[model samples]
Target: GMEVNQPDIVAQVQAAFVEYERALVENDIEAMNALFWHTPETVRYGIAEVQHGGEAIRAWRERCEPVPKSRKLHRTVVTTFGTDFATVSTEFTSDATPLLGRQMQTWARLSPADGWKIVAAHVSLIAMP
Candidate 1:
C-alpha cells in the first residue's frame, strides 16, 4: 500500500506557496516567472482572463501594476500525492476587493534542475454569503 501526503513533499508545497505569495505581493515578476513551467502546455485561469501558456500569464503579470494591498488568508491547504506532484489550495480575503479570492495550483517537478513548477492554476472570486 502507498500513503499520500508524505511529510517532505507536503513541506515542499508549503514552502513553494509561501515563496509564490511573497513574490506576488512584492511584485517580483522574475521570481514569479520562475515558479511556473514555461511551456505552451502551462495554463492559468485568472479571475477575468484565461491565460494559456506560461508566456502569456507571465507577460500579463509582469506588465500589470502592483496592487500593494495587504490580503488576509482565510484558509490554505497543501497536499501531495507522491514525491513529484502536489496541489495547493487557498482562500483569501482582500479588504480592497469585493469578492473573496480562491486559488488552486497544481505543481510538479519537470526535472531535477527545474524543481517544482506550477503546471496548472486557477483563480476566481467568491461572492459574499
Candidate 2:
C-alpha cells in the first residue's frame, strides 16, 4: 500500500510550493522555470493561455504579467503520495482585482538530484457574485 501524506514528503512539497508562490508573485521567470519539469510532457494552463510543454511554458512566462502584489492565499492544501508524488490546491484573492483565483499543481520527484518539480498546473479566475 502507498502511504498518503507522509509527514516528511508533505513538508518537502509544501516548501517547494511556497517557493514557487514567491517566484510567481515576484515574476522570477528563471526561478519559476527551474521549478518545473524540463520536458515536453510538462503542461501549464493559465487563465487564458495553455502551455503544452516546458519550452512553451517558459515562453509564456517571459511575456506574461506578474501576479498582483496584494494577493492572499486561502484554503491551501498540499498532499503527498508515497515519497514521489504530490498535489497542491489553493484559492486566492487579490485586492487588485475583484475575481477570485484558483490554482492547482501536480508535482513529482523525477530524480533525487532534481528534487520536486511541478509536472502540471492550472490557474483560473472566477467573478465574485
What lDDT is reached at residue 61 by model 2? 88
Per-residue alpha-carbon lDDT of candidate 2 for residues 16-85, written as tens digits (9 for 90 to 100): 9999999988989999989999789888999888889889988888888899999899999999999999
* Tens-digit lDDT string for candidate 1 (9-82): 89988888899988888888888888988889999998888998878988899677674468777779888887
Residue 34 in candidate 1 has what lDDT?
A: 87
Candidate 2 has an lDDT of 0.92
Candidate 1 wrong stretches, greater than 4 Å: none
For each candidate, give its TM-score against the true structure: 0.93, 0.96
Deviation from native of the Cα of residue 48 in model 1, angstroms: 0.9
Candidate 2 Cα RMSD after full superposition onto the native fold (Å): 1.1
Question: Residue 55 in candidate 1 has what lDDT?
Answer: 80
lDDT of 2 at 110: 92
